[PDB]
Structure formats: structure tokens, C-alpha cells
Design a protein around this ligand. Structure first.
Ligand SMILES: [Cl-]
Length: 328
């Protein structure tokens, strides 16, 4: 079982024998393993105590990510309750300003980020539970976040005012910064890293659309991860799926094995997409499964999709022995 906030305390980047990694208050390496909500506008019913209790207790998650797409400003309320439910259920919590369309974390439509982050931070001053993720997936869709240094620099100009502000009020939280091409470029930050001892860099992958190795070569995403790591950055996988990059297809579980070996061997924390019951391969729950499992109840394994079942075993760290899906 991966360590809970009750035993890990404040997370910080530590260095051991020349290598940086995510560590706890005691100065030991730690790995976070959990689940991301789907968009909190589309799937807010996951923000319930019985669900968060089940993920923490049964799935043995030490983290949950609250994907707030940027609909209504009322979505902000489900984030607050989610933060509350996570603290109360002994889990780290990623507050994800979930940019996607447009792709630019700056571009007009994302005005209130610093403002939003200010609010959450004020409500929970230097709370050990919270991890701030400033921009889910900077990307080229309706934006000039290009797949290069110039694109990384726009992301950096967006992130720094928010980081400084957070640090000024005494917030020593892990901050995770996204990067170009849907957060597949943590290597771009090597060129010009954020001067903050507790900033990490996102990487995202979908195992049906990305392999660790192909035709003898390290794949693009895995090698971009390696480049950031070799150059003294740390990487946190705030979103990966067992499906294709659409969120559907497969699941691709043999490829997931290889990704997870690669991440565990490098002590890279990871959060699986997603806690939906949408009819898509990446969704952890069957379409007929309620996102509230009931009072004192967990979801049964047969209420979980093939992906959900697989990720649950991996979060727990138990061998994966899939159930029979036919009975007569
Ligand atoms: Cl196994």
C-alpha cells in the first residue's frame, strides 16, 4: 500500500545519491497512485463521500484529481466539497484547472485561474493535502501553444504569477505544471525550468496511442519523460488512460503493464483517467454502475469496466487476475 497523508505528511522534492524524486516529510521517496474524476460539469455525482471512501479504502488510492473543466462558475463548489471529502478520506487531492479547449492557459476564456487558485489557497492555507495543477493540457487547439520552446515559454509566463502568489501567502504545496502537446513535453522545461524547489512537470499518455518502446526505439512520450528526468526535473503523471487518446478503444492492458513498470521503476506518481460511467473504454465503471456505491459500500469488481478493474489492482499493487466475464 502506497502511503496516505496521515503517515506521509507534507510532500517535497528530495535528493538521494544524486537523484531527485517526490518525497515525504520524513525525507523518504513516496509514490502517489489514484484516479481522476471526469469533467466535474459532466460527472459531478462522483463527488460523494461513499465514492471517495471506497477509492481511499478499497482501491487504496492516496490521491484523487478533481478535473474542473473551464459551463457554470457553480462547478467551483464541487471542487470545494471534493477537496473536503478527500481530506476527510485521507487522500492527497489534485486541484486541476482542466484546460483543454482552448489549448492556451492564457487565452481570454481562461481569465480567472490565479483568482481561482487564490480562493482555494485562502480557504485551505498551506494545507498538506492539496496539490495544485495549473493547466491540465496546454495544446495547439485554438491557441499558439506550439510544440517547442516558445510554447513552453507561454506556459511558463502563465504559471509563474500563479506560483509566486501561492508561495507568497506561505503555500508550500507541490505545484504540477503542464506543458505543450497535451502535456507530453516535460522535456521542453529542461531548456528553462521553473526556479521553485517544489514544482513538478506533468506527463500524460494513453496506452492505446503510445508505447514505452516501438521498433527498437523509446517512444516519444517515454523519451520526453526520460529527458526531463536525466536533466534533474521530476515528473508526475496527472492523467493516463488504458484506452486510445480519444478516451475509448481497448483497453490496452499489456501496454499498460509496460508503462506502469516504467513509471514505478522511476518513482513516478500516477493518476488514471477516469472515474466516469461513460460508455468508453477508459471509464472505470460500467454504464449501469452508479458513481455512488452506497453507504458503507464499495463497487463490486463486476461493476467495474475491464480498465477500472485493472487500474484498481495496480493502485493496490496486487497481482492482476481478471474475473470471468461470462457465466451460464
Ligand atoms: Cl500481475
Amino acid at each position: 500500500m502506497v502511503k496516505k497523508p496521515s503517515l506521509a505528511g507534507r510532500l517535497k522534492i528530495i535528493e538521494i545519491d544524486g537523484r531527485k524524486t517526490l518525497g515525504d516529510q520524513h525525507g523518504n521517496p513516496i509514490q502517489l497512485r489514484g484516479m481522476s474524476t471526469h469533467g466535474l460539469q459532466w460527472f459531478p455525482q462522483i463527488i460523494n463521500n461513499n465514492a471517495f471512501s471506497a477509492l481511499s479504502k478499497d482501491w487504496e488510492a492516496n490521491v484523487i484529481r478533481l478535473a474542473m473543466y473551464v459551463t457554470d462558475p457553480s462547478v467551483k463548489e464541487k471542487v470545494i466539497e471534493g477537496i473536503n471529502l478527500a481530506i476527510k478520506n485521507d487522500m492527497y487531492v489534485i486541484v486541476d484547472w482542466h484546460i483543454l479547449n482552448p489549448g492556451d492557459p492564457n487565452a481570454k476564456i481562461y481569465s480567472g485561474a490565479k483568482e481561482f487558485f487564490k480562493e482555494i489557497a485562502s480557504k485551505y492555507p498551506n494545507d498538506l493535502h492539496i496539490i495544485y495543477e495549473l493547466a491540465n493540457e496546454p495544446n495547439p487547439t485554438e491557441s499558439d501553444i506550439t510544440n517547442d520552446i516558445a510554447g513552453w515559454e507561454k506556459v511558463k509566463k502563465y504559471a509563474e504569477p500563479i506560483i509566486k502568489m501561492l508561495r507568497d501567502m506561505g503555500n508550500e504545496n507541490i505545484i504540477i505544471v503542464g506543458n505543450p502537446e497535451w502535456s507530453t513535453r516535460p522535456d521542453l522545461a529542461v531548456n528553462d525550468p521553473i526556479d521553485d524547489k517544489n514544482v513538478m512537470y506533468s506527463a500524460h499518455f494513453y496506452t492505446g496511442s503510445a508505447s514505452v518502446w516501438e521498433n527498437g526505439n523509446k517512444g516519444h512520450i517515454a523519451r520526453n519523460i526520460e529527458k526531463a528526468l536525466e536533466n534533474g526535473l521530476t515528473v508526475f503523471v496527472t492523467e493516463w488512460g488504458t484506452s486510445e487518446a480519444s478516451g475509448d478503444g481497448g483497453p490496452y492492458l499489456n501496454e499498460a503493464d509496460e508503462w506502469l513498470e516504467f513509471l514505478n521503476s522511476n518513482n513516478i506518481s500516477w493518476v488514471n483517467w477516469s472515474l466516469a460511467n461513460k460508455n468508453e473504454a477508459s471509464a472505470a465503471f460500467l454504464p449501469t454502475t452508479s458513481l455512488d456505491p452506497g453507504n458503507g459500500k464499495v463497487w463490486a469488481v463486476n461493476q467495474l469496466s475491464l480498465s477500472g478493474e485493472y487500474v484498481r489492482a495496480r493502485i493496490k499493487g496486487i497481482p492482476y487476475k481478471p474475473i470471468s466475464r461470462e457465466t451460464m
